[PDB]
Amino acid sequence: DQALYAIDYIKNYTHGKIVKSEYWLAKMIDLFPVAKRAGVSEDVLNQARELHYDAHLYWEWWTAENSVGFHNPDQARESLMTSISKSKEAVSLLNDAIDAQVA
Amino acid sequence: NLKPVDAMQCFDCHTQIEDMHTVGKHATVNCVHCHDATEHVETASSRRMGERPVTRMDLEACATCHTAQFNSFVEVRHESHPRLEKATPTSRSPMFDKLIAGHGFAFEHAEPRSHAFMLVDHFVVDRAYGGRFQFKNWQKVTDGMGAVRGAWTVLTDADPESSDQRRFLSQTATAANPVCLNCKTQDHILDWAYMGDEHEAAKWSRTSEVVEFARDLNHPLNCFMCHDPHSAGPRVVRDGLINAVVDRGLGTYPHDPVKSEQQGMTKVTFQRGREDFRAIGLLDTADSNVMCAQCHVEYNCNPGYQLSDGSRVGMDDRRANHFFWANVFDYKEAAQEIDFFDFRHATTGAALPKLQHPEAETFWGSVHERNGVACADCHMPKVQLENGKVYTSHSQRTPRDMMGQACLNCHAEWTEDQALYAIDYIKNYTHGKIVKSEYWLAKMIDLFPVAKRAGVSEDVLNQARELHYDAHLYWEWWTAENSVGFHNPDQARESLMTSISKSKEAVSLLNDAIDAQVA
Amino acid sequence: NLKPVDAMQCFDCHTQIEDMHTVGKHATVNCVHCHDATEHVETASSRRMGERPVTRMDLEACATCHTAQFNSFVEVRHESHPRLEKATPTSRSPMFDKLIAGHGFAFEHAEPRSHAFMLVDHFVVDRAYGGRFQFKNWQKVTDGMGAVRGAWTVLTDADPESSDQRRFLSQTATAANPVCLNCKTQDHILDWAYMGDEHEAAKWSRTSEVVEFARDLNHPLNCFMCHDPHSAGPRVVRDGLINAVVDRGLGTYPHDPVKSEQQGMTKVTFQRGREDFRAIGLLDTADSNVMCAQCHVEYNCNPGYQLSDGSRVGMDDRRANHFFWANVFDYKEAAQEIDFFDFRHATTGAALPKLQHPEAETFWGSVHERNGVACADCHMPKVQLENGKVYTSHSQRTPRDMMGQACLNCHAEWTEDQALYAIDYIKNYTHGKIVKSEYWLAKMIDLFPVAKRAGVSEDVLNQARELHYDAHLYWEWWTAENSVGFHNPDQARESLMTSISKSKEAVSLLNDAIDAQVA
Amino acid sequence: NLKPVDAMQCFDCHTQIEDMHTVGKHATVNCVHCHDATEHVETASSRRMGERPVTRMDLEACATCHTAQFNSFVEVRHESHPRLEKATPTSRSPMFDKLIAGHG
Ligand code: HEC
Ligand code: HEC
Ligand code: HEC
Ligand code: HEC
Ligand code: HEC
Ligand code: HEC
Ligand code: HEC
Ligand code: HEC
Ligand code: HEC
Ligand code: HEC
Ligand code: HEC
Ligand code: HEC
Ligand code: HEC
Ligand code: HEC
Ligand SMILES: [Ca+2]
Ligand SMILES: [Ca+2]
Ligand SMILES: [Ca+2]
Ligand SMILES: [Ca+2]
Ligand code: NA
Ligand code: NA
């Protein structure tokens, strides 16, 4: 029971970061149509697309990988926090650019 | 081996302790069990401490004579899933990230687990200390006894050379402050003035560097949080609770003055330099409702802002350590009473409250509470033995693990499966209303950017923000509260329906205003 | 609530206790936990007791600070079949009635059950008090905690107005005497002189009226039988054991002088006035082999007869309280040394010994004993907890209930089923030899009447009777002993084969002599 | 205790019931098990009901002769989770609220 509990600690923690990474990716993705329709520049959209590559990589690794972090818990944690960081950066970029078009 | 000291010599200077110790069930328990006071006795005067005696705060100080209670307490319930994030579709709050956006809980909010881990979990959670503190390795997460022996036996500090709150990992926050610790440990009971006010005799206060404070703390939920070590009698030590019940005259049962008088609390104050320093609350009865309410309440333990003008309320303000002592339907009034809110929503800009595990206030007025049932009856019952000396279980956990003693002794008409089914009926119903409340909150929240971009007036946005406060309160109470409605099913239902009503009103307001801008 | 007394005042007249109490792990445990001495202190001098202080012998005196050990001790093992007669085909000795004819055990000899019941079971067994004492009703047989609280809470006396040993039921015996009680209780520890010799300061002795003595006794296996209440250190209190080990110089391990020196006993005497009265044996180590050997030994605790001349040895004689402290192959010499036997066989007329549960003397020289294993390792191991403070189980029971802790910790090469299989191989083999020994004893016994009626000479009959002593000894050791060979399989085997050899020799002798009379 | 009624008297007005009851496996089951028709019989005519008879619709009307089937029927499957909302992520329709918006 103790060994199972140790497994589940890691998997539960990692899964929570997967879910949060997805929340932020989804929030970013859903800003792209708003930004395009608002007339945000291709330069800004391309900056956001570059961030999306990293946000995606540092999330999807872990949904693809079958151990839900157990095989390398510290790496999963660092990666998923990086994904969230990238998505947050993109969300801020896009929101500010949309807000500037509205104003 | 311990050698007894002359307690009469101590009592010559310590009359309050004499009065408690000589009369209670610890009258024969020598001071040496918990104090090393030799240099203190050599140096103290009538009213100056001299050299500080050592006081043991470890739970093993009690375990030599009360091994059964200690061992029960330190048990780890492995079925209580560890480090399980609430903001996931399979946990308590599937849309928590969207709803709580702007608050530090967005960084991590896990389900509770066994009491042994409270202090270590506080130290390591991603929202608390910027990731500064971690388990020494991922094996240590199982070690409840080790956590009890001391947090620093199982944790590491990323930088012992600095004492500032900062981020060591990217997606962490630094929400911890000294007030938090009062619901994780009382190792600081002799080093913290009542309420955490500034005091010349206090090492620590509300305004301390929390990383330095953390390093001085070791043990979870000390045995003496509920039991006076001198009299062995029932008590509370949590300042915020004593402040609500006694200082503010609200009573132990604010809705029931008779029960408050029968099951009351007496504030006892201890001085340093003939100035009030710290306080305890001696209970008339061994009332677990009030014992557990030291921590299982809605509270402030953080900086915030004023509802009136939006100005910052810092840790220095008394409001940074506050027990609202109010049920869900009295809470908005209680927050207005202190002119306080917690955060501004990141998307809507609404001033919002943050709700914390309000089990005590939820339980008030429920059928069980009105019938004289208390937390311990369901969560730490007497042990049933075919042959033996009865004692009280100290493994605070779900009644599902002990249904005979927790439920069926009262409910002789039910089998275990029937009682479980009754629990699940309430929890399933309540959870469905939580989920629906979240759906409507999320729908409303997502209209704010559309409305702002459409040029909807600030007057309309502010009307919607006022609705958001209520929609939020009447939802979040129930994701914060741990029983998923069981503690007060009718109240949960009324509250959650109120949340949905408020969100629907806001959605209609915003949709109509957007539609008017488009036309 | 208990109020502490001034222990230093006691110590002014009790230097012997002072020297034990101030040094051990009970230095902080006030006398009031176990003594009521107020009137004593008012009236005593250092040389005159004055009023006799009260001493508590109840086990609950220890349970308030040691609940885990107490509750473990009082557990009832329901799988240890109760009131199960050994003289049945499905128990230990299918032919016991034929073989033991002439002895009181023919009236009833049940298998042992849990320790909580030892005193009540002693009182109610059909061989002991003529049926005088009974459980209050047949429900009370389950009540281990009640028995521990006191025998007279669960039993009745058929005639409180008489104190003689008498038959109240037809098929009972009156074998109980005061020596028996020393292996059931030590409630009388301050009322019984060493060995039960006559003493001016003794209320009770070997020659007391056992029914009157019985009425003064309440508690089984007091905690202080193994632990000094003053020092908390390991000890024995049983006079017969101290007498064997110390007075007679045999040592704690008669077959191993080195181990005897390392794991020895110090006799401590207590005086009444200027006269030695009682004694204890402080152990060098917490050696359960010697603790359990207070009772789990072969003994005299009864009147008997001399081997030399057949004359009666009554309770007044020191031999009526005797630990032989001899293995099976030294026993005959040990009994010759004190010129003693127990009974004459009803059919054969042979002088025979009666053997009692000789676990201690059987365990000597076994592979486990020689490797430093002790009774507690298999029968009361440390408790293994995922999270908690370790303590020692005090539920003395078969290792089958706790194989992980009792066996597999040492035998990592085995699964539980494998270890059980190894136990059963020995017990099955040994039991088969017990049964065959009984077959041959019974065959011999049944030839005695045929030989007598055929006019076989008394010289031949006496030759056969001498063989009967040995055939009996080398069999009965193993029906008396509770492990069915497991404690010493090679010894059981050698002994039982010797029994069969002796019986076969007697059968041949008697058959030949009968045939010669017929011819 | 139930007392049987004269079914032939009922059948004089109730031919459809006669045709069904006399032929099936309830031919021996008297009307009193399910009907109290005394005032009805006193007042009915060939094709007017008169006073309405009482008809038992409770399932225990069948349980006296068919206890096994009744007891099986009334069993509660506790593993069939109660009051469990379908519009939740762990049930049947995680996005039900959005999709069914406008419906009760
Ligand atoms: C008078 C000369 C004293 C003697 C004798 C003892 N104590 Fe004391 N103690 C004394 C003072 C003036 C104070 C400060 C508080 C006050 O009442 O004014 C204390 C404080 C303590 C404490 C609290 C320590 C802390 O960290 O805050 C403890 C635990 C304590 N004292 C214990 C104690 C014991 C066990 C004594 C007998 C061995 C004892 N004290 C003697 C003054 C005097
Ligand atoms: C042995 C030297 C003890 C130490 C160390 C502690 N306690 Fe104790 N406690 C002890 C005794 C002998 C008793 C009385 C037992 C009885 O029923 O007579 C107690 C009692 C308590 C109680 C019950 C009090 C009541 O019902 O009024 C409690 C709650 C208790 N003890 C708690 C406790 C705590 C929390 C300890 C560590 C600070 C502790 N005890 C130490 C003996 C000993
Ligand atoms: C022998 C081949 C091993 C196997 C099989 C398993 N583990 Fe292990 N584990 C092993 C070692 C030598 C260590 C490091 C010990 C140290 O203190 O240096 C570990 C470590 C872990 C950890 C901690 C991981 C971390 O990053 O800190 C965990 C959670 C753990 N082990 C769990 C675990 C589980 C559940 C296993 C079965 C699937 C398992 N380990 C197998 C050695 C071996
Ligand atoms: C008493 C009024 C409390 C204050 C002040 C703080 N916490 Fe707390 N905490 C409390 C309880 C009763 C519980 C268990 C019930 C629950 O709903 O969780 C907790 C739990 C935690 C946890 C574990 C669960 C989690 O959210 O991850 C953590 C990590 C935690 N608490 C941290 C924490 C912080 C950082 C605080 C100050 C900002 C704080 N707590 C205060 C009771 C109380
Ligand atoms: C509050 C959250 C508690 C903490 C912390 C501890 N105990 Fe407790 N204890 C609590 C209750 C509600 C009760 C029962 C009161 C009633 O009358 O119903 C107890 C009781 C005890 C006792 C008395 C004997 C018994 O009933 O078991 C003792 C000796 C005791 N508690 C000891 C003890 C220890 C050693 C603790 C730290 C491990 C501890 N308690 C913490 C509530 C609370
Ligand atoms: C019985 C009538 C109860 C009383 C009195 C109290 N609680 Fe309770 N609680 C009860 C139930 C049936 C549940 C749900 C448990 C389940 O397994 O479904 C709970 C839940 C909690 C929890 C969370 C436990 C968990 O999920 O592991 C907590 C922290 C809790 N309750 C606290 C608590 C407090 C502090 C009480 C007194 C104010 C209280 N409960 C009373 C049943 C009962
Ligand atoms: C001298 C003035 C004494 C004081 C003070 C105390 N005790 Fe005593 N005690 C004293 C004597 C002379 C004796 C008799 C010794 C003898 O020769 O027989 C005793 C005896 C006891 C006993 C044993 C009684 C029995 O059953 O035989 C006990 C348990 C005892 N005393 C305890 C005791 C306590 C606890 C005291 C302090 C509260 C105490 N005694 C003081 C002399 C004196
Ligand atoms: C509380 C007031 C106690 C009473 C009553 C009894 N004992 Fe005790 N015991 C107590 C303490 C505080 C300790 C020391 C604990 C530690 O580890 O520091 C003990 C210890 C023992 C031991 C262990 C001794 C050793 O290892 O040297 C034993 C065997 C023991 N106690 C037995 C015991 C008996 C049999 C009691 C009834 C006569 C008894 N204790 C009462 C506290 C208290
Ligand atoms: C209710 C109709 C009962 C049934 C069913 C069982 N028992 Fe009973 N038992 C009952 C009573 C009223 C009494 C007398 C209680 C008293 O103290 O006056 C008993 C007694 C016993 C006894 C004691 C018999 C004796 O001669 O002393 C035993 C051993 C006993 N009961 C056991 C028992 C068993 C095992 C049952 C199921 C087979 C059982 N009883 C059923 C009432 C009722
Ligand atoms: C210690 C040297 C003992 C003496 C003296 C007496 N008994 Fe005993 N008894 C002792 C042990 C270790 C056991 C358990 C092991 C076993 O083989 O039974 C017992 C058991 C009993 C029992 C229960 C089993 C039974 O035989 O029915 C009874 C009724 C009993 N003992 C009675 C008894 C009598 C009457 C004694 C004096 C003649 C007597 N015992 C002395 C240890 C010792
Ligand atoms: C001899 C047959 C015993 C009797 C009677 C009691 N105890 Fe005991 N105890 C015994 C042993 C062999 C041990 C372990 C010693 C070792 O070092 O391996 C113990 C230990 C204790 C302790 C110490 C703590 C622990 O290890 O659990 C205590 C406090 C204790 N025992 C208490 C105790 C009580 C209360 C008893 C009556 C219910 C009792 N013991 C009887 C052997 C024997
Ligand atoms: C492990 C190496 C043992 C040691 C050391 C001692 N005993 Fe034992 N005993 C052991 C076994 C495997 C068995 C058979 C149990 C079974 O379930 O088959 C026994 C049996 C006993 C019994 C009878 C238990 C019963 O049948 O319920 C007694 C009374 C007993 N043993 C006593 C005892 C003594 C006093 C010991 C030290 C001198 C001793 N045992 C050591 C295994 C082991
Ligand atoms: C002719 C005088 C009748 C007699 C004799 C009985 N019934 Fe009747 N019944 C009669 C009529 C005209 C009607 C209305 C329907 C129709 O067929 O035209 C009925 C109706 C019933 C009903 C239905 C009642 C209802 O609530 O709708 C029942 C259950 C019924 N009748 C039963 C019944 C029984 C059991 C009789 C014998 C005791 C009986 N009826 C006699 C006319 C006549
Ligand atoms: C006793 C007076 C009965 C009452 C009341 C009800 N039923 Fe019955 N039923 C009864 C008998 C004697 C039989 C025949 C049994 C056989 O196999 O011979 C039946 C049969 C049925 C059946 C089976 C019919 C078939 O297979 O054709 C059914 C489905 C049935 N009964 C249902 C039923 C209902 C629903 C009742 C309440 C309205 C009811 N029965 C009452 C005897 C009795
Ligand atoms: Ca939990
Ligand atoms: Ca709050
Ligand atoms: Ca047995
Ligand atoms: Ca003998
Ligand atoms: Na020695
Ligand atoms: Na452990």
UniProtKB/Swiss-Prot annotation, chain A:
Residues that bind heme 8: 71
Superkingdom of origin: Bacteria
Localization annotation: Periplasm
Post-translational modification: Besides, it may lower the pKa of the Tyr hydroxyl group.
Family, as annotated: Belongs to the cytochrome c-552 family.
Record's subunit section: Homohexamer. Dimer of trimers.
UniProt function note: Catalyzes the reduction of nitrite to ammonia, consuming six electrons in the process. Has very low activity toward hydroxylamine. Has even lower activity toward sulfite. Sulfite reductase activity is maximal at neutral pH.
Record protein name field: Cytochrome c-552
Originating organism: Thioalkalivibrio nitratireducens (strain DSM 14787 / UNIQEM 213 / ALEN2)
Lineage: Bacteria, Pseudomonadati, Pseudomonadota, Gammaproteobacteria, Chromatiales
Segment of the intact protein contained: 449 to 551 of 553
